[PDB]
Amino acid sequence: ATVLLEVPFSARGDRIPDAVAELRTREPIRKVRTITGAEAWLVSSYALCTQVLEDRRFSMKETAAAGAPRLNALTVPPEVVNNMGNIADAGLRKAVMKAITPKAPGLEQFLRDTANSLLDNLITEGAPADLRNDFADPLATALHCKVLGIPQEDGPKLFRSLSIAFMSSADPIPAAKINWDRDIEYMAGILENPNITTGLMGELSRLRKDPAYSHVSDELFATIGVTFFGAGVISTGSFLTTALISLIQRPQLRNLLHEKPELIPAGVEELLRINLSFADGLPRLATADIQVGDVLVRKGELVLVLLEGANFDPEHFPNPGSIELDRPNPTSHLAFGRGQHFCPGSALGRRHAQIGIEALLKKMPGVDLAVPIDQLVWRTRFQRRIPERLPVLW
Ligand code: HEM
Ligand SMILES: Cc1ccc2cc(N)ccc2n1
Ligand SMILES: Cc1ccc2cc(N)ccc2n1
């Protein structure tokens, strides 16, 4: 006897397992067991993934209900899974969205200046350099301090919560509550701090004292700061790190982007499409009985939308494992989701990766891995796939 197929399949972010294409062809929705022991429906074709993400009867918020089959344990309060919903209900969606666009005056120059300073410090120190810990993550942390309006020197301590906050664990994590409560107290202090007048926290601090928002809770305001810092920093640092691996492993493309930097936006869109940074399918709970392909998903069951299942589907992206800069459907991948919950940080995430890549290719045009690829250590039981260190020379 064999056991029910377990997810996730591999924590490696540098290769897609051959199993995914076999599942997609044979059984694009099928039962799997998650790390909690729950059953779920794993959805792996582009057609069926888009169906589930575009049907709100597959609910994000209901994944937090007591008693439901779980992908992993909550690392935040259950009402917090619903954070964007709550932002919208408080009338704060347009203001949050405006504050996190990469369009603010000087923001792109700040990203460039910060990427160049981090790269000059690595060049001074000499090879090997670690492009995750000493490049992509500090660039993500400095960008999000600037976008929030909070001091750059507060970025490292907020960042240190993330290796626990974004765990994908079978059981509750006592350190995640200690760090969440601390980080909420920090963001509540920021809303009372008269020096914080710019970015997303300066805007929320003003709206807090405006009569049109006098009954929005102080818990929501602090929560938006902790959730957007952590989600933005983990998502952009982890995607930049694993896109740098895919670029370094393609020297022909690396040289083409170095020679024609105007192609970096189209290269970043293909690196988003092939990115394996999400370690688990996106979870949803059925709120009704709904036909998905050959399966009737029933009310209360867990569905997992496998982003690389959709993004490597050759029926939608022919020659899916190849980076092609002239596809006719280049932004139609699911790297930022789809539907009601499509990432509000999409533009910021694209600009962070374009600027970090442009700066790296100008400063270190000979960048290459300093260890054999199989020597990267892939973090396990985490919501992202990331190498613990990314050693390069140039
Ligand atoms: C390359 C970088 C990023 C990637 C690949 C990314 C990916 C995603 C994906 C796949 C979703 C959908 C989750 C779902 O439907 O279950 C999402 C949602 C979200 N993202 Fe991003 N993200 C990125 C950057 C950011 C940034 C920069 C921020 C904020 C500063 C951010 C904040 C959020 C929030 C708050 C949600 C939940 C939206 C809702 O529930 O309606 N993300 N992200
Ligand atoms: C439930 C949830 C909430 C916020 C999220 C933010 C992201 N960048 C990615 C996935 C997210 N998922
Ligand atoms: C045997 C079985 C299996 C899964 C079911 C899910 C439901 N929502 C209702 C009845 C069910 N019955």
UniProtKB/Swiss-Prot annotation:
Catalytic activity: cyclo(L-tyrosyl-L-tyrosyl) + 2 reduced [2Fe-2S]-[ferredoxin] + O2 + 2 H(+) = mycoclysin + 2 oxidized [2Fe-2S]-[ferredoxin] + 2 H2O
Cofactor(s) listed: heme
Gene Ontology MF terms in the entry: heme binding; iron ion binding; monooxygenase activity; oxidoreductase activity, acting on paired donors, with incorporation or reduction of molecular oxygen
Listed SUPFAM superfamilies: Cytochrome P450
InterPro entries the record matches: Cyt_P450 (IPR001128), Cyt_P450_B (IPR002397), Cyt_P450_CS (IPR017972), Cyt_P450_sf (IPR036396)
Record's keyword terms, sorted: Cytoplasm, Heme, Iron, Metal-binding, Monooxygenase, Oxidoreductase
EC category name: oxidoreductase
EC number: 1.14.19.70
Record carries keyword Transport: no
GO CC annotations on file: cytoplasm
Site (Participates in a stacking interactions with the tyrosyl of cYY) location in chain: 166, 180
Protein localization: Cytoplasm
Function noted in UniProt: Catalyzes C-C bond formation between the carbons ortho to the phenolic hydroxyl of cyclo(L-tyr-L-tyr) (cYY) producing mycocyclosin. Can also use cyclo(L-Tyr-L-Phe) (cYF), cyclo(L-Tyr-L-Trp) (cYW) and cyclo(L-Tyr-L-3,4-dihydroxyphenylalanine) (cY-DOPA) as substrate.
Protein name: Mycocyclosin synthase
Organism: Mycobacterium tuberculosis (strain CDC 1551 / Oshkosh)
